[PDB]
Every structure is written in structure tokens, then in C-alpha cells.
Design a protein around this ligand. Structure first.
Ligand SMILES: Nc1ncnc2c1ncn2[C@@H]1O[C@H](COP(=O)(O)OP(=O)(O)OP(=O)(O)O)[C@@H](O)[C@H]1O
Ligand SMILES: Nc1ncnc2c1ncn2[C@@H]1O[C@H](COP(=O)(O)OP(=O)(O)OP(=O)(O)O)[C@@H](O)[C@H]1O
Ligand SMILES: [Cl-]
Ligand SMILES: [Cl-]
Ligand SMILES: [Cl-]
Ligand SMILES: [Cl-]
Ligand SMILES: [Mg+2]
Ligand SMILES: [Mg+2]
Lengths: 730, 730
């Protein structure tokens, strides 16, 4: 599978220079104000999408659970205990079928959006990330998947929905990908903020994934977008559930509550230094479990990609129905039988007489985001056997569910198993060890954080998200020293979910940084000496030939270092372009194999899209007339058909007259970032990653271009293979 | 005044390559573990320094105020009302004198450390930033300045103290400035975290000031440092004030408290949408005041630098004593007369009979960080006249105090005037307008935040610091939409305190970003064509001549494009170094004015320090023998005398034998970052800023070096002058 990176690097050429000359300070200030307005609109739209999803998820869930409640109440008195199962199965299967059809419509909507957002922020452009149909399919599939009791979440796909909104809103200026990547960073930040209630967590997630040079003017805007999203979602959701409209009573979709201890016990604390030891042991034991999660889930995915994906589209819908059937049967049987109902608004009474409520029913039949509040702020409600069985039956089914053709998330099903484990360990420690003054909410929170660390294996952004979700600043060390321990324990075995699922698809991904040994390798070894080049004043026949034959997206405009009009024009351009030191000072004062691999002086870079745009129009001059005669496309005309540039195969190829010269000098990028063949892989990777650039040319000390480097030359597998070859040769 | 930038850019040469060859994966893992240990030690040391400062500040303040309390109690009954003033003056003047002597010892300790940290993180190396004596002088001057009632703070100098600790601890490896800058970033983050209780605010401050490429492995470490500092300071300060040791009851030196409303009023909220309008009007009115602050303070500083600084050292001590005398007299008179004591542990009863407490006395005679809690969480304690007079008498004296030769801060004196203004506006709105359900704590907090925005004019970091100090996540929009409004209102008049005070000193500072028009200017216009160059295999006489004559810190190793042994060796090196495209593919398969301004082929960069190190040793070969004979200094030997490299004037110049060839090829940086003369100022600034590099060479398309660019070529004044010249010429 092949993917095309983003054109993030700014191309400054003659039309851009003309536009810059036209633009003054006042126009720049107006442009910046319009950018602020667009950012605010993106944030508000993300908040409204979150409100939509939450409102219909709650409506459908409450409706189906009320029907099931009445059916159970009647059928238990009758003793049938079967019709309620049939109605629950009907609801679950219908919802899962409606959620899977929408993913069959748009395949990229399957699963959490983070694997498809880590790549776009990396600039890989997975086909179908940012599109209206993808947004509609994911939004309408989340509320039909989580409402079906599939043990999935809503805060995962919110990031992808925010990214799509942020890519879509600015496009009615703002055409270039240099702005689109920033706007999708803002959209992802807004999505995270609306999902978890943490705006700073969202902006740090956007900074961490879209790694680039520090841009304060953009970080301020993305922080504003996150705050606006999380404070319009708050405003609507606290004005709908309650009666007060102006109040801001509840944060985004996932909130933990108020972590306060009872005032009766003065000795009680949120956490103490002595408990910190447990916070590392829960970090390891949880982290190992996270690794086990990976060890299962990957083994499932590689199965499906070999036995489920290459099957007719009728399959991948039967699998979703099977998963829904199994999870519904497991939930119903576990609540009916294994549930140990004890004596007494989210309290469920099932299958046993009055003044008795099933803890299992309160865990399963409540919403997942409402089964975390009980695990955090209720003590004595849950027996150890119930917690153990809930952890077992919510860990296997979570592994089995993720990957099927429905929208899903992995932050609630991972925050719930961890919370159950923390509650279980707190109960065990309180009972057997007898260590008093253990606030079980802290242990449940630490278990949830450790399980996220083991499964997701994120840092910085995850720590901030958790800290701002807890709404406590004193719980900053226990949360972070367990994320770090879980990450270090789970890194010995295998990577995280998102890294695994972006490596399975074959996406060319640049890692965070290189190892120590990579500096042994030089930039002369990862480049490709064989080049496809475009002369200035080249023939149109040569352009169409190299465009149809080759699939590269950028060509170095070069001149040979060692017809008549073409050669004369190239020589004149070479003489005029070069700027000597003495000439510059004077200006300031005035005020076969050898033929195949030929010395070529590097002059610039021209994209395939720009060449196609030139070919479509009549931008070309006959050899008889001078090079001055050119239509001279402006910036606006060259930016037309931006989202989808025409292909060379699409173009008619009949109207174009071959053997007629075309000038590519005014439109190329005369000053791209260049590296020497002696540069080490660390510096090359640093430029290619932080600058977000593409098609880095390697030029030696004589000025001749000696190679070209793209993302495919800097992938981890390529570096490992080249390092192994370097070791073998010496 | 001249300043020398940091050598942040990594120089990879032959000794470094040998060390890399020796180093394996296990040694790298051990190195990374040692780095983690160093980061943790830096955080713990910063926390302990904060504990030291807080404990002695509290001890001295409580002692002097107890003595003053007893003296007032006796003298008011006697009616003398004078001996208490004498004792207070004695304490204040003694403390201020002891604080000013320590700044006369170390001049760079004067004022807040942020102006001297924004420059070091920018890589300017102001002389005396990171030194043991500077740390001792600042730490022992803060507790003698704030204890003297000088209307100053402690959280400002904590950043500088953390930076000094982070620069000092790693140096017992870790020698190069590439590590020192990262460690001072971690130290500044730890200082901010210990000062304000916000670790994430500290790491974001470090990211925002030391602008560079994204480094996750470093951001994780600096976050760990901040958390460790703020949780060891918490552990000690909550175990000393209280009896419980393991508990973490209070955050760092500046805490706001618990922003909760009374449970009696259900209708009450922290803030509502309708109040948001006021939050922008307080943003403007406060911001304007901040501008006025600047408009005064700068006018004072430019006065002193012309009438106080060029005076004997006896002056700058009399001024501090005068300021202390005036502020003590003002405090005593305002509390004695203007105080309107009302009927009833931080409650002060002065000069009026029983069951009456002076609100003015409770404002002034309490610690400044304890006069913010009252303004946030007490209603009806303060009359409008008292608040107005307190704002007037705490705004003029704050302007007058800052800049004198004592350690000081500007976050408490700015957080207290803003809090007083917010309390006053809340009282006025409640009384006259009658708008009920107004929680005055929110108004005081918004006033304080708006005043900080007007004075300090920071974003991102300041917003996070305030949000985590308030310990509330729902107060995230009102705080930020008032910082942004204050910044936009105060930017029309003049810049912030720190920018003003770093522009007065003449520090060459790179701004956050360039304007729109700067892209009109090219890299050919900001470079210097006149070059001081070093040939490979150059004569030692030429090196000593160009080292003594010129003050540049880097020279391009070049060869002429157009004795006998020297010329032969240079020609051989030029032939061997160049790597052609065909040659590389074959290797892979095998497996006057004109004389002054001469074409020179760029090969590398050699620093002045490296040349001096080579000259000190006998690294040189006679012309009779070949170039193979070289002592070949290793990496460890070249890294000796790192903190202070020898000067060319210091070296004897007698033992060195002139006219004897020296080879600089093995030790130069063969692959520095280069730019084309056609690059625009935006890209050049981006590389020079984010990469943190130094001495960027401009090389044309023939491979000849055409210019050199340093920080002095990218300062705002230089760009403005060059743009004006460009406009004038055309
Ligand atoms: N113009 C070019 N001439 C020769 N080789 C090239 C050229 N551009 C890229 N390459 C190299 O060819 C290989 C594959 O190129 P490919 O066609 O996949 O690149 P691309 O699609 O233009 O790049 P990207 O995936 O970064 O958008 C890589 O090693 C790349 O460095
Ligand atoms: N080797 C050099 N030859 C010629 N000009 C140079 C050289 N190095 C720097 N310059 C230029 O000379 C001017 C002043 O140089 P200066 O001596 O102040 O630099 P420096 O002290 O080496 O640099 P820095 O302040 O970045 O540490 C600037 O325009 C700078 O770009
Ligand atoms: Cl989720
Ligand atoms: Cl997810
Ligand atoms: Cl301060
Ligand atoms: Cl300060
Ligand atoms: Mg491709
Ligand atoms: Mg200098």
C-alpha cells in the first residue's frame, strides 16, 4: 500500500512574491482576525457534535434499558426470564447492524480515530481521513455502537470528528496544507477537550503527535479552540440535564467527579507517602496486563486481515452481530446468576427480592461512563468476587471487540477495567492486610491510570488529561509515577495499541527519535542517487514522459554541470542565477553508467501538481519566440483545483503540442532545505521531522545534487536495514 | 555591550565518531538512567531551596511583627505611637541593607531572574547567570528583601535559583552546552513549579521561552523535575507547619486556596455566562493599568541607568534605604490613620479599641501571600475606600521599588493589586448595581489575572499557571479570555516588563517570529560577505594572527576555488572530500576588491575554542613530514577546560613555532546547517531559532560560501533597518 505525505513546507515562488508585495500590514491583521474566527467556529462545531453524540446516546440507552427493565419486572414474576433477553438482543443487534452498515459505506470509520490521526498529524494522508461522509458515518455509528452494549467508548472517535471538522470548516485563502495541518491540530485538540474535559491535555496531545517546531501563535489558537469546545459542550450539557442554563456544572463526556474525602474522618487523606509504594506495584501489575492486552489484540487483528478482510462484504457484518450476541448473553447471564445482590439513583434491582440490588447489574446495565463514578466514589458496594469476575469479563470481551467493523474507543473500556482492578486491590488490602485509612477512590484512579499506561502507552498528554479529569492538583505524582512505570514495564514486551494498528496497515511512519547507533549511518547511505530531474526550459514531451513513467511527486530542477534554443536558455539561466560573493558585495556597494549518473547542478524543486497545472493551461512558449512570452499564472489560478489536482492520465494529451518549450523557473521552489552528504542521520531526521518538510535533496560541496531523501528513506525499517548492511560491509 | 551565544548545535567530528563507535546500546541505556537521576536530583534541590527561603522568610517576618505588635500594644496605651515606628524602621532598614550588600557583591542578582532566564534559554549567556555565588547572593537576598516590607515577591527569583541549580548539578559527561541548556530548562520548570505549585505551568514556561524543536524525551524529564520539586516542597512544608508528615496538604509558596461557594446558597455558582461580559471589561481596564505600570517603570529605569548606575557603589544602597524608609512610613501611616477598623487568625487590631480590627492593618501587616487569601475568600471584611487606597498605595510603590539593587519579584505585587481591584469592583457592583449572586472570589481572581496580563503580558504558560493555582478546571475560560484581552489592550501602548528590561540592557534577542514584510527581504541581504576563513592545513602564524585580530567565535574552513606542501595538502584534501553522484553510486554498487572577495569553496566550520585548544597542545606537523603525524586529541582531552576556554591573549605565544602547518580537518564540523542566498528571512529565522544553531553559513549553488549569519544579523532592529534600506533602494 502506498501513501502520499502532506505538502506542509511552504513554497515561495513568483506568484507568492507578487501576492506578498500586494499584501500590507492591515491586510495581515485582518487575515489573522479571520483565522481567530475560524478557530472559534471549529471549536464550537466540535462542541456541538459532542453534544449531539451524548444526547442521542443517552436517549437510546435510556429507552432500551427502560423497556428491558419493564420486561424483566414482568417476566421475573411470571418466571419466564426469556422475553427480556429477546428484546435486549433485538435492540443490540439492530443497533450494531446499523453501526456496521455505516462502516461498510466508509471503511476508514472502523475503530478509534487516533491511529488515523497520528498519521495525518505526521503527514501521511491516509485516504479518507478528513471527509464529510467519514464524519457523518463515524458520528452516526458511534451512537449506534455504544448504544448496543459493545463495550466501546465515545471519547475516541471524538478526536477524529474534531479533526474532520477542523479540516472542513476553514475551506469555504487557507487553501494550502500548511494551514490545513494546523487546523486539524486545532480540531484534534478541541476533540480531546470535548471528550475528556481537558483543554490543556488536548493542546499537549496536538503538540506531541504533530511534532514540529515551536509555534506560539498556533499553540495559543489551539488552546483557545480546546477551551471554546469544552466550554460550549459544558454550557449545553449542563443546561439540558439541569434547569440552569448559564451555569457550567459538568465537564465533557468523561468526568470523574469530586475527589474529596469524608469530613467525619480528619485523619483521612487523598493519598500519603507510605501508599506511594503501592502506586508503583499497581503500575507494574497493571502494565503487564496492558501488555497482555496487546499480546491478544494484535494476534486477533493479524488473524482478521488474513481470514476476515479478504471476504465478501456480507462478512464483517456477521462478525459484529456475533460479538454483540456474545456480549449481550454474557452480560445477561453474569447479572442474572453470578451477581450477588446485597441490601441497599443508578441502582439496579434484578432477579432477587425487594431491598436487594445486584452489584453486577449496576456495573453492566448502567452506562459505562456512569459505572466509573460508582467505582470511584462508592465503598462497600462491591464484593471482591464481583470485581474479579467483572475484570475478567470486561477484559476478554474488550480485546475481542476492538477491530471489528464498528466505530469504537479504547479509553473507557481501559479506564473501567483499571478502575475495577484498583477497587479490588483496595478491598483486598483493606480486608486482609488491615492497613486502615485507605481512600479507595485513589486506588481505583491509580488502577485505571496504570491500565491506560499499559494499554495506550502515552505520556505527557495522557498525564495532563488524567490530572485535569480528576480536577485535583495534589494527585499529580501518584498518577504520573504510575504511567511512567506502566510504560516502562509494558515496553519490554510489545508496543501500544495505536502503534501496533498503524504498523499493521503498513503506514510509513516517522518515529519520535532515532537510536544512538543511527548516527553511525550517514546521509550518503539513505539517499537514492538515481534521480528523475527536470531542466529549466524543458520540453513538454519530456515532462509528459517522465510524469507518465514515474510516480514521484517532486523533481529537482537542475542544469547539466559539464534544441539550440533550449540549451541557450538553460545556459543563460545558469549564468544569471548564480550569485558570487564578489558580485554580491559589489551589488551592496552600488545600492552507460557515467552518462546515466551525470554531474547536475541543483537549482530548485518542482512538484508534480505544479507541473500538471502548468501542462493543463497553455503555459508554454515556442522556440522561435523568447522566454518572456508566458501566460504567467497568478497565485489564485495556481491554487485552483487544490483538494484534488488532475492526474497526468486524466489529461487529454491530445491538445498539447510536443517539442515546445515550457519554463518552470518562475513556479519552482528556488530555496528548499538542503543537506550535505556528510550530515548524519540525526540531523537529517531532525530537519525532516520538525520542519515537516518533504523531498529533502542532498547536495555535495560542489553544488551538484547527489541524492534525494523522502519519508520512505527515514522509516525505522529502512534505517535498521541500512545499519545492518553497514555493519556487514565493514 | 557584547554577549556570546550558546554552542547548542552538536559538533560531530572524528573524536566524537570514535566515542560513538566505542558506545553500545547498554552504555546508552546507562547514560539515560544517569540523566534521569540527575533530573530528579535537580528537582529535589530546587524544592529544598524553596523550603529554605520560605522557612526563613516566615521566621524573620513573624519575629519582627511580634516585636512590633508588643511595641504597639505598649505604646498605644502610653500614647507615644513612635517607638514602634523606630523598631520597624530598624528591622526594615537592616534587612534591606543586608539584601543590597549581597547585590553589590553580585550585580546580576538585582531584580527578578526572568529577564536573565529568558535570555539564557534564548542562548545569550549573560555573564553571571549560572554561578554558585549568584545563587547564594539571590537566595540570601530574597529572604532579607521580602522580610523588609519592600512590596516584593519570592516566586520570581525561584526561577533563577532553579536555573542555577539545574546548570550546576549535572557538572560534577554532560559537559556540552547541548545538555546544559536542557538542564537549565528543567531547572526553570522546577523553579516555576515550586514557586506557584504548577508543574505543567513550569514545563510549558520552559517550552515557551526556550523555543526549539519538539523533544519528547526532554519534555518528559522536565515534567518529572517539576513534579518532583513541587512534591518535595509540598512534603516538607506540610510536614513542618502541621504535625502530619506523610500528608501533602498545601502546594508551593503561592497558593490561592479552595474556590468553593457556600452550601447554604444553592443558586450560587463560581461564575455564570452573564458575568462573562464583566470578565472582558475587567480585562481592558486592568490591562490599561498594566500599560500605565510599564509607562512608569521604564521611565524610572532609563533614569537610573543615566543618573544612579554611573555613580559610586555607596549609591544604589542609599536608594534602597530611601525606598524602605518611604514604604515603611507609608504602611504605618496608612494603617494608623486611613484604616477604618470594623467590628470582628490573621486579624490585626491596631490603634482602636477592643472588638475592632483595622482592615488596612490586615492588608499590610500580614504577609503578602497571606493578604491574597483574604481578598479571595473573605466578603464584607473590606470597605471600598480601603480597597481603593490600598490599590493606589500598592501600585505607585510597586513601580518605584522594582529596579533597585535588591532581589525582587513581580508576581505577588501584581497579583495583589489586581486582587484588590477585583474586590473593589465586586463590592461596587454588588452595592450600586445590585446584581446578586456575585461570588466575589471569582471577581478578585479575574482582577488579579487581568493585572498580570497587563503587566507581565505572557500567554500559554501564565494561563496554565493560574489555572493550576486556582485548583479549578471550570475557571478556565474566564481566566484565559481576560489574559488575552489584557494582552491585546496593553500591546497598543508598550511591551511587558521583561521585554522592556531585556531591551534596556541591549541584549541581542530573537523575537518569537517575524512580521509579514520580512519575507520580502532575502538571506542575501542580512549576511556579511566579508569573511575571516581558515584553510585546512593552515599555518599556525595565520591562526594566531586571525585569532588576535578578530573577535569572531567561528570560522568557515574553506579552500580556494580558483608553501608548496600547504598547497599540495589543501589540493589533496579538496580532491578527496568531494563526493560525486557517479562515485557514490559506484561505491554503493561495489559494497584589490576582487582579491579581497574571492571564490572560496565551503567545507566546514571550526570554532575559536577548538582552534585555541589545538594551539595550546602540540597538535601540529612540520612541512617535511606528512599530515598523518598528529597528536590526535581525543574527545575527553578536547572537552577539558570546558567551562572557561583559554583566551588567545592569555596563551604565551612564545613556545609556539610559527610557519608550521596545523590540520583542522579532523576536528571541524564537516556538516553544518547551510542556507541558499535565495532563502527568505522566514526560513532562515526558523532554522536559527528552532534548531538553536549558531553561525549559519550562506552558500550559493556553485558550492562557494557567500556569507555568514549570526544572531546579530537576525535581531529585530537589524531586520527593520535592512527592510527600510530595501524600501529606499527600490
Ligand atoms: N524525484 C525523485 N527522483 C528519484 N528518486 C526519488 C524522487 N523522489 C523520491 N525519490 C525516492 O524514491 C523512493 C520512493 O519514492 P516515492 O515515489 O515513494 O516518493 P513520493 O511519493 O514522491 O514521496 P512521499 O511518500 O514522501 O509523498 C524513495 O527512496 C524516495 O526518496
Ligand atoms: N567568521 C566570521 N567572519 C566574518 N563575519 C562573521 C563571522 N562570524 C560572524 N560574523 C558576522 O560579524 C558580525 C558580528 O560578529 P560577532 O563577532 O559579533 O559574532 P560572534 O560573537 O562570533 O557571534 P555570537 O554573538 O552569535 O556568539 C555579524 O554580522 C556576524 O554575522
Ligand atoms: Cl474513548
Ligand atoms: Cl481511542
Ligand atoms: Cl514572584
Ligand atoms: Cl518575577
Ligand atoms: Mg507515493
Ligand atoms: Mg561576540
Amino acid at each position: 500500500k502506498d501513501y502520499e505525505s502532506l505538502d506542509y513546507d511552504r513554497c515561495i515562488n513568483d506568484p507568492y512574491l507578487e501576492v506578498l508585495e500586494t499584501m500590507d500590514n492591515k491586510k495581515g491583521r485582518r487575515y489573522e482576525a479571520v483565522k481567530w474566527m475560524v478557530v472559534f467556529a471549529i471549536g464550537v462545531c466540535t462542541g456541538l457534535v459532542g453534544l449531539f453524540v451524548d444526547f442521542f446516546v443517552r436517549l437510546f440507552t435510556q429507552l432500551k434499558f427502560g423497556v428491558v427493565q419493564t420486561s424483566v419486572e414482568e417476566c421475573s414474576q411470571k418466571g419466564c426470564l426469556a422475553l427480556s433477553l429477546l428484546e435486549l438482543l433485538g435492540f443490540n443487534l439492530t443497533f450494531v447492524f446499523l453501526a456496521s452498515l455505516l462502516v461498510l459505506i466508509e471503511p476508514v470509520a472502523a475503530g478509534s480515530g487516533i491511529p488515523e490521526v497520528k498519521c495525518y498529524l505526521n503527514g501521511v494522508k491516509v485516504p479518507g481521513i478528513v471527509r464529510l461522509r467519514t464524519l457523518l458515518c463515524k458520528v452516526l455509528g458511534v451512537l449506534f455502537s455504544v448504544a448496543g452494549g459493545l463495550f466501546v467508548e465515545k471519547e475516541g472517535p471524538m478526536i477524529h470528528s474534531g479533526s474532520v471538522v477542523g479540516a472542513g470548516l476553514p475551506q469555504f485563502y487557507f487553501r494550502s496544507d500548511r494551514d490545513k495541518r494546523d487546523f486539524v491540530s486545532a480540531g484534534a485538540a478541541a476533540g480531546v477537550a470535548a471528550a475528556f474535559g481537558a483543554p490543556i491535555g488536548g493542546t499537549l496531545f496536538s503538540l506531541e503527535e504533530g511534532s514540529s517546531f515551536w509555534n506560539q501563535g498556533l499553540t495559543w489558537k489551539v488552546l483557545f479552540c480546546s477551551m471554546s469546545a469544552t466550554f460550549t459542550l459544558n454550557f449545553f450539557r449542563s443546561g439540558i440535564q439541569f434547569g440552569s442554563w448559564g451555569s457550567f456544572q459538568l465537564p465533557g463526556l468523561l468526568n470523574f467527579g469530586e475527589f474529596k474525602c469524608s469530613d467525619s474522618d480528619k485523619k483521612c487523606h487523598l493519598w500519603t507517602a507510605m501508599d506511594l509504594g503501592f502506586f508503583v506495584v499497581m503500575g507494574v501489575i497493571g502494565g503487564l496486563l496492558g501488555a497482555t492486552f496487546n499480546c491478544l489484540n494484535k494476534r486477533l487483528a493479524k488473524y482478521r486481515m488474513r481470514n476476515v478482510h479478504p471476504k465478501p462484504k456480507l462478512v464483517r457484518v456477521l462478525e459484529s452481530l456475533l460479538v454483540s450476541l456474545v456480549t449481550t448473553v454474557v452480560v445477561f447471564v453474569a447479572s442474572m446468576v453470578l451477581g450477588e445482590c446485597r441490601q441497599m439513583s443508578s441502582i439496579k434491582t434484578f432477579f432477587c427480592p425487594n431491598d436487594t440490588y445486584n452489584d453486577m447489574a449496576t456495573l453492566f446495565f448502567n452506562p459505562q461512563e456512569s459505572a466509573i463514578l460508582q467505582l470511584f466514589h462508592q465503598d462497600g458496594t462491591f464484593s471482591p468476587v464481583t470485581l474479579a469476575l467483572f475484570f475478567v469479563l470486561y477484559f476478554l470481551l474488550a480485546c475481542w471487540t476492538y477491530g471489528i467493523s464498528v466505530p469504537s474507543g479504547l479509553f473507557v473500556p481501559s479506564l473501567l477495567c483499571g478502575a475495577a482492578f484498583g477497587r479490588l486491590v483496595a478491598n483486598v488490602l483493606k480486608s486482609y492486610i488491615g492497613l486502615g485509612h485507605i481512600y479507595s477512590g485513589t486506588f481505583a484512579l491509580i488502577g485505571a491510570a496504570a491500565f491506560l499506561g499499559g494499554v495506550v502507552r502515552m505520556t505527557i498528554s495522557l498525564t495532563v488529561i488524567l490530572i485535569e479529569s480528576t480536577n485535583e492538583i495534589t494527585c499529580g505524582l501518584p498518577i504520573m509515577v504510575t504511567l511512567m512505570v506502566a510504560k516502562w514495564t509494558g515496553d519490554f514486551f510489545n508496543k501500544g495499541i495505536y502503534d501496533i494498528h498503524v504498523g499493521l496497515r503498513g503506514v510509513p511512519l516517522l518515529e519520535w527519535e532515532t537510536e544512538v547507533e543511527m548516527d553511525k549511518l550517514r546521509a550518503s547511505d539513505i539517499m537514492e542517487p538515481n534521480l528523475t530531474y527536470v531542466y529549466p526550459h524543458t520540453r513538454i514531451q519530456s515532462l509528459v514522459s517522465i510524469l507518465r513513467t514515474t510516480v514521484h511527486h517532486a523533481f529537482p530542477v537542475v542544469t547539466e554541470n559539464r534544441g539550440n534554443q533550449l540549451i541557450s536558455n538553460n545556459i543563460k539561466f545558469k549564468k544569471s542565477s548564480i550569485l558570487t560573493r564578489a558580485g554580491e558585495q559589489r551589488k551592496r556597494s552600488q545600492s552507460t553508467m557515467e552518462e546515466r549518473f551525470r554531474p547536475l547542478t541543483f537549482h530548485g524543486l518542482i512538484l508534480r501538481s505544479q507541473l500538471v497545472t502548468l501542462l493543463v493551461r497553455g503555459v508554454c512558449y515556442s522556440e522561435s519566440q523568447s522566454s518572456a512570452s508566458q501566460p504567467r499564472l497568478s497565485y489564485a489560478e495556481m491554487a485552483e483545483d487544490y483538494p484534488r489536482y488532475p492526474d497526468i492520465h486524466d489529461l487529454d494529451l491530445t491538445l498539447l503540442n510536443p517539442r515546445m518549450i515550457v519554463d518552470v523557473t518562475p513556479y519552482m521552489n528556488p530555496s528548499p532545505f538542503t543537506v550535505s552528504p556528510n550530515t548524519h542521520v540525526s540531523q537529517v531526521f531532525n530537519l525532516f521531522r520538525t520542519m515537516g518538510l518533504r523531498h529533502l535533496p542532498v547536495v555535495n560541496a560542489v553544488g551538484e545534487i547527489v541524492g534525494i531523501i523522502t519519508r520512505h528513506n527515514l522509516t525505522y525499517e529502512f534505517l535498521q536495514a541500512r545499519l545492518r548492511q553497514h555493519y556487514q560491509t565493514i
